[PDB]
XYZ file of N, CA and C in Angstrom:
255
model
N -9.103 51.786 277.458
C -7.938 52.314 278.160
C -7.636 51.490 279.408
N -6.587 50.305 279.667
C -6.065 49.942 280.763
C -5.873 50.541 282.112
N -6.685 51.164 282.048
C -6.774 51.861 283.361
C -7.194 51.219 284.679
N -6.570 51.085 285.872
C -6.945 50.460 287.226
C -6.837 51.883 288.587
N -7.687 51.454 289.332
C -7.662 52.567 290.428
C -6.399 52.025 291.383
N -5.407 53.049 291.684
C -4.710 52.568 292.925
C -5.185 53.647 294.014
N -5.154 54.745 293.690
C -5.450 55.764 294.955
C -6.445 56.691 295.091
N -6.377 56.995 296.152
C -7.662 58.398 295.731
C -7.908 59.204 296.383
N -7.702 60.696 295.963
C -7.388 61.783 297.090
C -8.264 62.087 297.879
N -8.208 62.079 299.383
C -8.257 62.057 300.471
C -8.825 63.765 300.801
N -8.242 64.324 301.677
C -8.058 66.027 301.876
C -6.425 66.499 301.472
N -7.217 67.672 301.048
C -6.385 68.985 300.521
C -5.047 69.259 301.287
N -4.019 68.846 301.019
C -2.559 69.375 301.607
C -2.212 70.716 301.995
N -1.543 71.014 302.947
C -1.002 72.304 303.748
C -1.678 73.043 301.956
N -1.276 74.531 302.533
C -1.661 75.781 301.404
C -0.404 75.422 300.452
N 0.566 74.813 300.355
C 1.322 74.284 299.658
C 0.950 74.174 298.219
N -0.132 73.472 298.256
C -0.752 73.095 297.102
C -0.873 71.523 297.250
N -0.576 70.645 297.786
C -0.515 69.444 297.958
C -1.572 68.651 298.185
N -1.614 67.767 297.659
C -2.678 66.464 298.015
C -3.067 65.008 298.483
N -3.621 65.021 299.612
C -3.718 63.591 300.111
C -3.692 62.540 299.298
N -3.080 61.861 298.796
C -3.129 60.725 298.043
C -3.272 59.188 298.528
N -4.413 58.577 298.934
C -3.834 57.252 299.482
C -4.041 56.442 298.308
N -2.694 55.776 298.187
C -3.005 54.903 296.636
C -1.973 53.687 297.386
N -1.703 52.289 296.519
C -1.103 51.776 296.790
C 0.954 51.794 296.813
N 2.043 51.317 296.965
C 2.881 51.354 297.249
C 3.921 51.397 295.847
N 2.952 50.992 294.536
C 3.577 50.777 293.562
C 3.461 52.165 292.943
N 2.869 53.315 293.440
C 2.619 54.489 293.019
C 4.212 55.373 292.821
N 4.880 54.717 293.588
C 6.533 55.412 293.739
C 7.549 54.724 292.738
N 6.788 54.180 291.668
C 7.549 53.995 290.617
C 6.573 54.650 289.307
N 5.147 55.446 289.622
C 4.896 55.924 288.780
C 5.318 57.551 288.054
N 4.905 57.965 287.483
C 5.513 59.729 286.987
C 3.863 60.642 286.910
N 3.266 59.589 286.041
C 1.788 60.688 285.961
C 0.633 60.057 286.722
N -0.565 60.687 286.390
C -1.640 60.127 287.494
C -2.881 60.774 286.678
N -3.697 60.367 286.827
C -5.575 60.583 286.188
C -6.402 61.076 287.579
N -7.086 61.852 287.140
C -7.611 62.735 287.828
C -9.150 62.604 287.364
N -9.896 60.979 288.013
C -11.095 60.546 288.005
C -12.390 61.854 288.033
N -12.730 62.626 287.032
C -13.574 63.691 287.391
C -13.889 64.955 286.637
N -12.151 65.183 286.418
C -12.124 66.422 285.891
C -11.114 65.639 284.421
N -9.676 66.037 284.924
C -8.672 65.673 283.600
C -7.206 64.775 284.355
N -6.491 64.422 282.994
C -5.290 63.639 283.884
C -4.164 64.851 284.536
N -3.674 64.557 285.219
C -2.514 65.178 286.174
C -0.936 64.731 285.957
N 0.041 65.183 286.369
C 1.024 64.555 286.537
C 1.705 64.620 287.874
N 2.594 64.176 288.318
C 3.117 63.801 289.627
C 4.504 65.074 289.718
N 4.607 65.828 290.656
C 6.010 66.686 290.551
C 6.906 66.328 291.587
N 6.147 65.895 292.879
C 6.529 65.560 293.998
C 5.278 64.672 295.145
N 6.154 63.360 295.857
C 5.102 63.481 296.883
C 6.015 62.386 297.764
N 5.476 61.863 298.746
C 6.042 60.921 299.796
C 4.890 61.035 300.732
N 5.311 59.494 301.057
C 4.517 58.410 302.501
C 4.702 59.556 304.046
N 3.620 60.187 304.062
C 3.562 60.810 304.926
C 2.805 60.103 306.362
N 3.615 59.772 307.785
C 3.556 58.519 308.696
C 2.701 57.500 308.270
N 1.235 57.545 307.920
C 0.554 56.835 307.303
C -0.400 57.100 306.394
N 0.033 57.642 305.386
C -0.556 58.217 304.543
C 0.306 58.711 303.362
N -0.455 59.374 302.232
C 0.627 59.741 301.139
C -0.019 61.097 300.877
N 1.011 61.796 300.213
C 0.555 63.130 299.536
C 1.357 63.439 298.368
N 0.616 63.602 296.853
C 0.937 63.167 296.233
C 0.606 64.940 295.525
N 1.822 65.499 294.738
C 1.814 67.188 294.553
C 1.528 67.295 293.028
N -0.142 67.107 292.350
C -0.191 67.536 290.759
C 0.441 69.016 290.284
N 1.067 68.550 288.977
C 1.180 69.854 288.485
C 0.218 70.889 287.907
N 0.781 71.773 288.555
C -0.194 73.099 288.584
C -0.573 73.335 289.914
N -1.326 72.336 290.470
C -1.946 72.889 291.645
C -1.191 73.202 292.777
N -0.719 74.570 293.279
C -0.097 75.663 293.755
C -0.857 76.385 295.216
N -2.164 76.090 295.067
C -2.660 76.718 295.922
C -4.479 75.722 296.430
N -4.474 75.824 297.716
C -5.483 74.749 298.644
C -6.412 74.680 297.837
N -6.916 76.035 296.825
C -8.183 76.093 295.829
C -8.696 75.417 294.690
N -7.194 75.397 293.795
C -6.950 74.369 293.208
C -6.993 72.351 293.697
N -6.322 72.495 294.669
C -6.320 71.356 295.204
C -8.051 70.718 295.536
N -8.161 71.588 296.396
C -9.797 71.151 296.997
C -10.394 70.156 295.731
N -10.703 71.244 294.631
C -11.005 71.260 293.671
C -11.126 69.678 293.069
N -9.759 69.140 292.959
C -9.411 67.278 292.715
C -9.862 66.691 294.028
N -10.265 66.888 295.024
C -10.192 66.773 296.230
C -11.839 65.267 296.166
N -11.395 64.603 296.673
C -12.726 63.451 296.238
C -12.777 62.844 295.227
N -11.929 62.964 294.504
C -12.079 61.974 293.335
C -10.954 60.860 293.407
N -11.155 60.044 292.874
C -9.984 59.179 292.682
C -9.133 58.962 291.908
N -7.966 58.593 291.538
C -6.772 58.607 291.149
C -6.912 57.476 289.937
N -6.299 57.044 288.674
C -6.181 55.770 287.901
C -4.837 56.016 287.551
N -4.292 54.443 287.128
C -2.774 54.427 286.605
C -3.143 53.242 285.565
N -1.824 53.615 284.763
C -1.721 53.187 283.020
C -0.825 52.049 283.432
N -0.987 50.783 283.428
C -0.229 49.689 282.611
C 1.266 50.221 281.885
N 0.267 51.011 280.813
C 1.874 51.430 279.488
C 2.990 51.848 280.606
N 2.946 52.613 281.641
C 4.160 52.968 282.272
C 4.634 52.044 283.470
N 3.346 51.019 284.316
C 3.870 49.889 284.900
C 5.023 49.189 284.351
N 6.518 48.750 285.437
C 7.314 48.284 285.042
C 6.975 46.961 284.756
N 7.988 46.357 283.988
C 7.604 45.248 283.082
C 7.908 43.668 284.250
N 7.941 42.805 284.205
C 7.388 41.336 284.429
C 8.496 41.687 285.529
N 9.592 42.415 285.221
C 10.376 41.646 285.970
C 10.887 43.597 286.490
């Protein structure tokens, strides 16, 4: 599986449900995300927060959930990297 690490969650976002994500810059052209630990995730929402990112999996709704992914790191797929150009 083409898999490479760009990011990797950090601490647990407001009770929101949200999650620290620091990954690299090419992450804002991705949609889903791997969840080094447990299972893969997908992306619903997130943005470059002053220096930092927070990056919102689906499902996770509440800090408990979150914690939970909380330390592991992030992988991204090639297949959805945009192409050469």
């Amino acid at each position: 599986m083409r898999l490479v690490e760009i990011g990797r969650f950090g601490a647990p976002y407001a009770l929101k449900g949200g999650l620290r994500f620091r990954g690299e810059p090419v992450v804002l052209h991705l949609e889903r995300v791997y969840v080094e630990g447990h299972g893969w995730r997908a992306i619903e929402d997130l943005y470059r927060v002053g220096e930092e990112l927070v990056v919102h999996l689906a499902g996770v709704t509440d800090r408990t959930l979150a914690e939970a992914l909380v330390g592991l790191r992030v992988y991204a797929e090639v297949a959805d990297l945009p192409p050469l150009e």
